[PDB]
Amino acid sequence: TPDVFISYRRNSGSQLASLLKVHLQLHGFSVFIDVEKLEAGKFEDKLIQSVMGARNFVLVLSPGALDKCMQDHDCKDWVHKEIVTALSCGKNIVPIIDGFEWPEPQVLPEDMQAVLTFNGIKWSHEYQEATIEKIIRFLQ
Amino acid sequence: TPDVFISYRRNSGSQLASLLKVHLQLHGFSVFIDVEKLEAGKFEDKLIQSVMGARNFVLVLSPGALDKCMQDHDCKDWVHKEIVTALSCGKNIVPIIDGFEWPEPQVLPEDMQAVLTFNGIKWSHEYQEATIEKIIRFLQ
Ligand SMILES: Cc1c(NC(=O)CCc2ccc(Cl)cc2)n[nH]c1-c1cc[n+]([C@@H]2O[C@H](COP(=O)(O)OP(=O)(O)OC[C@H]3O[C@@H](n4cnc5c(N)ncnc54)[C@H](O)[C@@H]3O)[C@@H](O)[C@H]2O)cc1
Numbered sequence: 001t002p003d004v005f006i007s008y009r010r011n012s013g014s015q016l017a018s019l020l021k022v023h024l025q026l027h028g029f030s031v032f033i034d035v036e037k038l039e040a041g042k043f044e045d046k047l048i049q050s051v052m053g054a055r056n057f058v059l060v061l062s063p064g065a066l067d068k069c070m071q072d073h074d075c076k077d078w079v080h081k082e083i084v085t086a087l088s089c090g091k092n093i094v095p096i097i098d099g100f101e102w103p104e105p106q107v108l109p110e111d112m113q114a115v116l117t118f119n120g121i122k123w124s125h126e127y128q129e130a131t132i133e134k135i136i137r138f139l140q
Numbered sequence: 141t142p143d144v145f146i147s148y149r150r151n152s153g154s155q156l157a158s159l160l161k162v163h164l165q166l167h168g169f170s171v172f173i174d175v176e177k178l179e180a181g182k183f184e185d186k187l188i189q190s191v192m193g194a195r196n197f198v199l200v201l202s203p204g205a206l207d208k209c210m211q212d213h214d215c216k217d218w219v220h221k222e223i224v225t226a227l228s229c230g231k232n233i234v235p236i237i238d239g240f241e242w243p244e245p246q247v248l249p250e251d252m253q254a255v256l257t258f259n260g261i262k263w264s265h266e267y268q269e270a271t272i273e274k275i276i277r278f279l280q
C-alpha cells in the first residue's frame with residue numbers, strides 16, 4: 001500500500017506528476033502513479049482501491065485540469081472520480097498548483113466542491129527544492 | 141564545469157527540463173539548468189560560456205518550443221542563441237521530443253537549420269525509465 005496517490009490530468013500534468021513521483025520516492029515515500037503501478041485487470045476498481053489505500057492524495061492542478069470535471073454530473077471523468085474517492089475516505093488531500101486558475105466552487109460538481117477547502121502548495125519552478133520540502137511537510 | 145547543458149522553453153518545457161535534470165544528476169552527470177546554476181552577473185556571457193563548457197547539449201523540444209526562434213534572424217531569442225552556440229561548438233546535441241511537431245527547415249533561421257540533422261529521443265510518459273536509459277546512452 002503506497003503512502004501517496006498522485007492524481008493528475010494526462011494531457012497537461014504528466015510531467016509535473018512524474019517529477020513529484022521521483023522526488024517523493026527519493027525521500028522515502030511509496031507512491032502510486034498509474035503509469036508505474038496500475039497493472040493488469042479492470043482499472044476502475046484498482047484505481048478506487050488505490051486511492052482508498054493511500055494516506056495522502058496529491059492532486060496535480062495543471063492549467064485547466066478540472067475543466068472536464070465541470071458538468072460531469074454522472075462522475076465519468078477519472079480525476080473527478082479520484083477526488084470524490086479521496087474526499088469520501090477523508091484522505092489527506094494536498095493540491096499542487098502549477099499555473100492553475102482557482103475555480104469558483106459553484107462551477108464544480110457538488111460532490112467535489114470541498115476540494116477548495118484544502119490548503120494547496122504553489123509549485124515554484126525557481127525554488128523546486130523548497131517546494132518539495134513543503135510537500136513533504138504536508139505529507140503524513 | 142557541468143557535462144550537460146539543458147536548453148528549454150520556459151513557458152512549455154520547464155517541468156520536463158527539471159525532470160531531466162533530476163534523472164541525469166541521479167545517474168551522476170553534472171547538469172546546467174538556468175534555475176539552479178545561473179547565478180549573479182551578466183547572464184548573456186554566463187549562458188554562452190555554460191553552453192561552451194558542456195560536452196552535451198540536451199534540447200527540450202516541448203510543443204511550440206521553437207516558435208519564438210522563427211524569423212528571429214537577429215538572434216535575440218535565447219533558445220535560438222543556445223542552439224547556435226551548440227552548433228558552432230560542435231557539441232553533442234541530443235533533442236528530446238515531447239509532443240513537438242518537427243518543423244521544416246525553411247521556417248527556421250539559417251544558422252539553426254542543422255539542428256534537424258541530429259538524432260532525437262522521443263519522450264515516452266509510459267516508459268520513462270527506458271527513455272532516461274536511452275538519453276544516458278546518448279550522453280558522452
Ligand atoms: C482509462 C484507462 C485505461 N483504459 C484502457 O486501458 C483501455 C484498453 C483497451 C483498448 C481497446 C480495447 Cl478493444 C480493449 C481495451 N487504462 N488505464 C486508465 C486510467 C488510469 C488512471 N487514470 C487516472 O485518471 C486521471 C487521468 O485522467 P485523464 O487525463 O482523463 O486520462 P485519460 O485521458 O483517460 O488517458 C489515460 C490513459 O488512457 C489512455 N486513453 C484514454 N482514452 C484513449 C483513447 N480514446 N485512445 C487512446 N488512448 C486512450 C491515455 O492515452 C492514457 O494512456 C489520473 O489520475 C489517473 O491515475 C485514468 C485512467
Ligand SMILES: Cc1c(NC(=O)CCc2ccc(Cl)cc2)n[nH]c1-c1cc[n+]([C@@H]2O[C@H](COP(=O)(O)OP(=O)(O)OC[C@H]3O[C@@H](n4cnc5c(N)ncnc54)[C@H](O)[C@@H]3O)[C@@H](O)[C@H]2O)cc1
Pocket residue numbers: 146147148149150151173174178183187218219222
Ligand atoms: C533573460 C534572463 C534574465 N533576465 C533578468 O534577470 C532581468 C533582471 C532585471 C529586471 C529588471 C531590472 Cl530594472 C533589472 C534587472 N535572467 N536570466 C535569464 C535567462 C536565463 C536562461 N535562459 C535560457 O533561454 C532559454 C529559455 O528561453 P525563454 O523561454 O525565452 O526564457 P524567458 O521567457 O526569457 O524567461 C526566463 C526568465 O526571465 C524571466 N523573464 C523574462 N522576461 C521577463 C519579463 N518581461 N518580466 C518578468 N520576467 C521575465 C522569466 O520569468 C524567467 O524567470 C533556456 O534555455 C535558458 O537557459 C534565458 C534567459
